[PDB]
Design a protein around this ligand. Sequence first.
Ligand SMILES: CC(C)(COP(=O)(O)OP(=O)(O)OC[C@H]1O[C@@H](n2cnc3c(N)ncnc32)[C@H](O)[C@@H]1OP(=O)(O)O)[C@@H](O)C(=O)NCCC(=O)NCCS
Ligand SMILES: CC(C)(COP(=O)(O)OP(=O)(O)OC[C@H]1O[C@@H](n2cnc3c(N)ncnc32)[C@H](O)[C@@H]1OP(=O)(O)O)[C@@H](O)C(=O)NCCC(=O)NCCS
Ligand SMILES: [Zn+2]
Ligand SMILES: [Zn+2]
Ligand SMILES: [Zn+2]
Ligand SMILES: [Zn+2]
Lengths: 189, 188
Amino acid sequence: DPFQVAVGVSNRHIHLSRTDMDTLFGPGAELQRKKAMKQPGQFAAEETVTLKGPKGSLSKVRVLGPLRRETQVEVSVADGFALGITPPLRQSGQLDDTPGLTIIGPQGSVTKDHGVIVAQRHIHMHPSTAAKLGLRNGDEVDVEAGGERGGVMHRVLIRVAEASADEMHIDVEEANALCLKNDDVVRIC
Amino acid sequence: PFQVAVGVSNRHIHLSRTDMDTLFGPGAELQRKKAMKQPGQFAAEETVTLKGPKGSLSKVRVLGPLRRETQVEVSVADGFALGITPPLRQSGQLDDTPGLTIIGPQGSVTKDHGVIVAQRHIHMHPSTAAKLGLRNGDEVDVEAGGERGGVMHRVLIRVAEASADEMHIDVEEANALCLKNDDVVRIC
Ligand SMILES: CC(C)(COP(=O)(O)OP(=O)(O)OC[C@H]1O[C@@H](n2cnc3c(N)ncnc32)[C@H](O)[C@@H]1OP(=O)(O)O)[C@@H](O)C(=O)NCCC(=O)NCCS
Ligand SMILES: CC(C)(COP(=O)(O)OP(=O)(O)OC[C@H]1O[C@@H](n2cnc3c(N)ncnc32)[C@H](O)[C@@H]1OP(=O)(O)O)[C@@H](O)C(=O)NCCC(=O)NCCS
Ligand SMILES: [Zn+2]
Ligand SMILES: [Zn+2]
Ligand SMILES: [Zn+2]
Ligand SMILES: [Zn+2]
């Protein structure tokens, strides 16, 4: 079924700028690959950080490479409460009016004034696949999950880009609410 | 009409008298902290620590009153934190379930069973069930609006006299829908 798409489940994690990488891991430090993600060029790094909010901290928070233009922190709704912040629900890069927190690495720390979000679900899709399915960048679709916690997710954003692999991204709470894990399959309706 | 209020459940425990005595002392009684929506049910002041093969969860709320048999309700995520795989179950369906060590102020007990991931359900008063043409054991689709809107399939209807109209979901199910206590969802 060509409308079936693989699931990628995201635990809390961070993307770093070079300025913050330098602060956290030392000047000129380079991320080490641990595991490639499904999206071209993206990977889980060996490196981890601590996130510290007004209420508490989350440790062993995975860094995702490569480095980006701007630091971005993705956490679950649950994580927000543990941290003591209220991150808005956003697509990647949509960081206007977002809270920050303190990031701690082995060689230093920095207190960000912004950049923390709850990740809004979405489907990455290659232009060829989009053509075959009749979808365009920015379309919203329903997505159905089978099984014991089966259901439908409404108005899921389609992100079409040449450097993309066909994959739906949801966070760990969204996945557990559907009894899904990495490489499970869902269906675009 | 077909609208029902949401009740969101964090991890918690229901205790037997035998286990209550061990954990909190012989003849100890639960102290009421807050009434739940369901008649007779309440969050207690008492809390325990849950300990599994991999790790522990602390400040786990006890729900009263005491029951015939200890039952532990945790999230899928909680299962991974503890190091067990609880099946998805309705309350009281505890055959072939894993256990845990329950740690209290006056003692501890290692249970050989009783931990579940709570399966979502709607508590419904018989009058309400009548109005909606629903009977006990029926399954229904439930829709949530908002920015994580969607539909939950095959939600079990639990009719009983001592019930209030309320959907019960766990904290991950709620956060996956950006719902909290007293938000309204709709039976399809
Ligand atoms: C079951 C219940 C009593 C659990 O007790 P509890 O854990 O003490 O409940 P609380 O609401 O006080 O939870 C407080 C914690 O949840 C956190 N929290 C708040 N919103 C949260 C969210 N959306 N996601 C994750 N955590 C959240 C708080 O930060 C707090 O953390 P802290 O203790 O470290 O300060 C409670 O969930 C409840 O009353 N549910 C109503 C639904 C119901 O009736 N269930 C019946 C089960 S049979
Ligand atoms: C984002 C990512 C790299 C985060 O790295 P990570 O946190 O190190 O990932 P892991 O899968 O190894 O998480 C392992 C932890 O999750 C726990 N875990 C496993 N399944 C779980 C579940 N269903 N619910 C909660 N926790 C779970 C494990 O017990 C373990 O905890 P521990 O470290 O205390 O032992 C990872 O989630 C991922 O690879 N996602 C793929 C999807 C993707 O590409 N997202 C990109 C977003 S831009
Ligand atoms: Zn990310
Ligand atoms: Zn993504
Ligand atoms: Zn319960
Ligand atoms: Zn219930």
